Design a binder for this molecule. Structure first.
Ligand SMILES: O=c1ccn([C@@H]2O[C@H](COP(=O)(O)NP(=O)(O)OP(=O)(O)O)[C@@H](O)[C@H]2O)c(=O)[nH]1
Ligand SMILES: O=c1ccn([C@@H]2O[C@H](COP(=O)(O)NP(=O)(O)OP(=O)(O)O)[C@@H](O)[C@H]2O)c(=O)[nH]1
Length: 326
């Protein structure tokens, strides 16, 4: 077994949150918000004199892709769900359609909100993000998400299920398990080391897309038993180094200097840079913490004391990373 592998797997056990298909609590919180939208929609449509449109829900985000992590103590997790309304996109305003959902949920938990890319509804210790789509069958065969706020506002080409397929299909079996563990490791690193300023934090979807582009399996196959052991520390080292290698100095005419920028395109429509909202200064801070994480992964390979190897990693991963006594 690889150095620190046992402690990586124990860390993984502590940070993992079970996917929808394995998690009754998340399925119930999801389904309660879905019910709340159906009932809520009757109310909104009683003023327009016809049946509210029906919707088809589907799982999205980390609990659909089995890349979910528990929040830090007193943080919130996000349940992500898509609803495809039985509407033609050209017949309705995206913000109008997101308004229906917001007003449907106005009086659910601590209220609803219209975001650039979703309607978010707040409850204790978690929020639910409802991506709102028009019917492809009614909208010229494309799946379009409702983008923009009151203060702003389009139907944008979207492919959440294609993204989810890409993440599921990149690898299989125990190879795909290491891939998923390494996404979760970086999500906990993100939560632990970007807690000062949430806006500066690399989005979960960006770490997932980065893994899609750049993650490589690390495993060794015994010359005798042919028995296979995974090396998460080495997989993470190679993955982090590859991300660092893809930062590019980018000139900023206002500040008259360069900032290092990591561009991570979604591998499906709309193929946008998921990190495009991060400022140059937030990118410089992201790069420096990634470099510090890389340095710790290399130190952890070289320590004679397992205590010192694990301590070096706990400095970047936080309180759930096991540190054996010296
Ligand atoms: O397909 C999609 C796309 C987007 N989303 C949801 O959209 C959210 C992305 O976050 P956001 O873009 O909706 N937030 P925003 O209002 O732009 O913040 P800011 O302008 O800085 O003040 C995420 O929480 C996703 O879960 C989906 O759920 N599904
Ligand atoms: O830019 C994009 C593109 C796509 N999506 C879509 O939104 C869904 C996930 O929504 P999300 O933004 O919450 N991503 P997630 O993986 O849950 O990060 P995290 O909560 O930190 O673990 C996915 O099914 C994507 O297809 C976005 O949210 N943003």
């Amino acid at each position: 077994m690889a150095p620190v592998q046992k402690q990586f797997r124990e860390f993984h056990d502590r940070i993992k949150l079970a996917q929808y298909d394995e998690n009754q609590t998340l399925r119930d919180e999801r389904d309660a918000v879905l019910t709340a939208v159906r009932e809520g929609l009757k109310k909104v449509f009683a003023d327009r004199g016809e049946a509210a449109p029906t919707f088809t829900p589907f799982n999205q985000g980390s609990y659909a892709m089995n890349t979910g992590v528990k929040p830090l103590e007193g943080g919130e997790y996000d349940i992500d769900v898509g609803i495809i309304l039985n509407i033609a996109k050209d017949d309705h305003d995206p913000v109008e359609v997101k308004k229906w959902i917001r007003d449907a949920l106005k009086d659910y938990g601590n209220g609803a909100e219209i975001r650039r890319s979703c309607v978010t509804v707040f409850k204790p210790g978690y929020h639910v993000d409802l991506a709102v789509y028009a019917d492809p069958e009614l909208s010229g065969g494309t799946l379009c998400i409702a983008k923009g706020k009151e203060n702003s506002r389009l139907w944008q080409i979207s492919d959440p299920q294609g993204f989810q397929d890409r993440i599921a299909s990149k690898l299989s079996g125990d190879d795909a398990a290491q891939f998923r563990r390494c996404i979760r490791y970086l999500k906990r690193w993100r939560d632990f080391r970007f807690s000062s300023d949430g806006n500066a934090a690399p989005l979960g979807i960006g770490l997932t897309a980065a893994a899609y582009w750049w993650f490589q399996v690390s495993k060794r196959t015994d010359p005798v038993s042919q028995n296979v052991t995974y090396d998460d520390r080495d997989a993470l080292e190679q993955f982090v180094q590859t991300m660092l290698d893809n930062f590019h100095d980018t000139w900023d005419s206002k500040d008259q200097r360069s900032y290092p920028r990591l561009t991570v395109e979604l591998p499906v429509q709309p193929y946008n840079d998921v990190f495009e909202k991060m400022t140059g200064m937030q990118m410089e801070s992201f790069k420096s913490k990634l470099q510090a994480l890389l340095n710790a992964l290399k130190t952890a390979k070289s320590r004679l004391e397992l205590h010192d190897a694990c301590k070096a990693l706990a400095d970047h991963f936080g309180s759930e990373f096991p540190v054996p006594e010296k």
